[PDB]
Amino acid sequence: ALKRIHKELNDLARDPPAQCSAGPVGDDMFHWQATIMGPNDSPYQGGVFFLTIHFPTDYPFKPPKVAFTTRIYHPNINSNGSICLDILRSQWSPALTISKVLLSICSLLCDPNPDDPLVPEIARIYKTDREKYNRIAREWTQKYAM
Amino acid sequence: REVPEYLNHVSKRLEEEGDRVITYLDHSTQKPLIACVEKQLLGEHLTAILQKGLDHLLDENRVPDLAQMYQLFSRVRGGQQALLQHWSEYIKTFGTAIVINPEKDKDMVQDLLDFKDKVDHVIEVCFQKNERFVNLMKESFETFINKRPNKPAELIAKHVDSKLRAGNKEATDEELERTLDKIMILFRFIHGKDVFEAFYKKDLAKRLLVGKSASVDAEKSMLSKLKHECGAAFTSKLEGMFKDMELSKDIMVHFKQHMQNQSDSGPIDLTVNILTMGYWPTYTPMEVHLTPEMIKLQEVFKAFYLGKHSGRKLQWQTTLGHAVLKAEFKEGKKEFQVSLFQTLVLLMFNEGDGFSFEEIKMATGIEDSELRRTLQSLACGKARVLIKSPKGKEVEDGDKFIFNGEFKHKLFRIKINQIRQYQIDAAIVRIMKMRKTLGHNLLVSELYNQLKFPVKPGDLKKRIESLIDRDYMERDKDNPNQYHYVA
Amino acid sequence: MQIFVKTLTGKTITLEVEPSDTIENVKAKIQDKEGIPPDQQRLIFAGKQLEDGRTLSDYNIQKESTLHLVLRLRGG
Amino acid sequence: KKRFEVKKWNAVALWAWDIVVDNCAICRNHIMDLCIECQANECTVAWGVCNHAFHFHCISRWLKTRQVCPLDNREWEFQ
Amino acid sequence: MLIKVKTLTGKEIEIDIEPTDKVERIKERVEEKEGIPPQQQRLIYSGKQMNDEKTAADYKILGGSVLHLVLALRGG
Ligand SMILES: [Zn+2]
Ligand SMILES: [Zn+2]
Ligand SMILES: [Zn+2]
């Protein structure tokens, strides 16, 4: 529904989340662009990763197709910039609003789960050697996020 | 010669030299001559001229001389820049005189509005609307208005209340909005704007609940500026008040019909405003010994309103109400629009011509401090409906107030209610980027010079350690005191 | 002291907490405030999971701060 | 001689909710205010055993998509 | 109008601008009230990195429209 998206947009403009920002890209309110500043105390510090939200025609009862536009290093995010959250495919809940899905993604930037990973190649590096992970993620952030 | 005459002398001389060139000197000598004379007349005395004349001249609002001054100073290289300073510093010097002195509170805003209009006028006429001077006019006002925390906002808020009040019949509709527009250009410069709302909201709360607003169209005009100036979030709570007044009248239509359908309608003609508790100023409920006919009227309404909207609760504000008490004096009947406290206390002065301060108190239950204020309104006011024994301005516990049956007043209806963490981080990388190599000691020194807040040594070191971790800065291989720029 | 938390339903509620308090009790306070089970909360501060076996003082949380509440998720 | 009588009266009264607005999560409306779909023109509020409030017109559709409360993960039944 | 430029920490810096100011003006105003020179800002409004030549009216910035500020430590 639009009215749900309208209310989300207004209540986000008034009281924005701290390190998040999302608004329509143009005339079509169903196509937002968001932005997840890299959480502090993480390899993504100082980064600004742009998402691309797409709300379906029944948005309250059906998840939005969010997908990173800035190539992010993450076991749970493929090089194409697609996420695989369980909340976003299987356990979508209408009570969860865009200000919340963006914040949950921001939290998951620091809390991956290499078990059942969308990118096993990075998942193996993360599981085995976390020291190298925090450097490869840092260089990807510096070469894409800044 | 004084500066105002001296500028005329310089204006004369330049044109003579300008006239000489056309007369007999070759045109190729036009420029070096003018610059030569111009350098000596003004270029060597820019500070001397400005100090002697500008500060005096600006106060007198001498339009022509300033126009001559700005016109002349533009010729010198850096002359105009020298004029911005002594003009800018004049604002911060004379401006502070308006705000710093607390003894000038009653005449604060009008000076700020007047002094604002004056400097703007100088920009429009003399300085040829120079955009650079416009900015430093805005930037300068922002500074000195904020040298007094939270008081200019209060006075601007109090000022707008006076303009909008029903007592402000003198300023017509067109005149008023122009005054507000000048205020909004002044309200922008304040920093503690969140303090302006509470002072303007509390005043606006009084305006609606006593119907003293001069022009409803002027009210809605005001918020249309704040909403455009600070967004709907800033003015969200304000607009809720207007809805409540709008919604309350609708409730009165439905409620009044209910009493008409009932054959038992009290002589008391009733109106009650229903206001969303979240928006309005916080009021402390306080109990009063209402009469048996008085207590019923809320009960029918409270049940009625609740019956029409479940989940609500109407907790009353006896303080903000006001009733009418037609009186039977010895020289004609009079009406008294009186608050509930005045209503109850004045309902203690008929059976007995007088009662003690304490005799009334347990009868009604008002707080002593406010009961005294109420009684003062009934004895010491212009409409002396009581005779205080002993007579005086202030009320005492031993007072046996006596009802004034000899009350005389011109009007028939009368009123008595008159009574830093990232900042450190950003600077460190910024400074070190330029340097490309630096020690700890200088890096520490320039921070306080470049940071306008205290910096603890422990906090300062922690950021340095954090920046080392993120590869922003690197220590020397052998000198921990010495850092190097990495990227 | 107290702390602000932004529940899922758009509302905001204030929690009376101490820095020594552990996150498990924080989630229990969220529960008896509105009632989503201790397991399903996932408190977020600066985009960080608030681990159950820790206390606010661990995460550098002070007065008038804000904690964000979401629904429990997982990787993929 | 003795006359305790009142002839008119105006007052005010602040209204507050019994417990809380109970913000619907599906539609983000106010409980007395109708469902977001129902505004476009009898929209009742239906409780879950969680005590969670939802407009019937919202929670019915969500149930038609999922027999799960959106806030809590328990199942949906009224009282 | 007022734009409140809230950074990561949650501090909500107030700013004032005319409807036609170029965003370089916005960054300069942030410099005065916060101290970060315009080279090291990256203002993000509603998920669009503002570009240093666009006028504020381009983005439909209104009263009380919150921006976001993120530090670019390099910042040229
Ligand atoms: Zn409905
Ligand atoms: Zn539930
Ligand atoms: Zn609903």
Numbering used by the authors:
A (entry chain D): 2 to 147
B (entry chain e): 254 to 672, 692 to 759
C (entry chain U), E (entry chain N): 1 to 76
D (entry chain R): 19 to 59, 67 to 104
Copy the relevant paper text.
During transcription-coupled DNA repair (TCR), RNA polymerase II (Pol II) transitions from a transcriptionally active state to an arrested state that allows for removal of DNA lesions. CSA acts as a substrate recognition subunit of the DDB1–CUL4A–RBX1 ubiquitin (Ub) ligase complex (CRL4CSA) that ubiquitylates Pol II in response to DNA damage. Using cryogenic electron microscopy, biochemical assays and cell biology approaches, we found that ELOF1 serves as an adaptor to stably position UVSSA and CRL4CSA on arrested Pol II, leading to ligase neddylation and activation of Pol II ubiquitylation. Therefore, how the CRL4CSA Ub ligase specifically targets a single lysine residue (RPB1-K1268) on the surface of the multiprotein Pol II assembly remains to be elucidated.
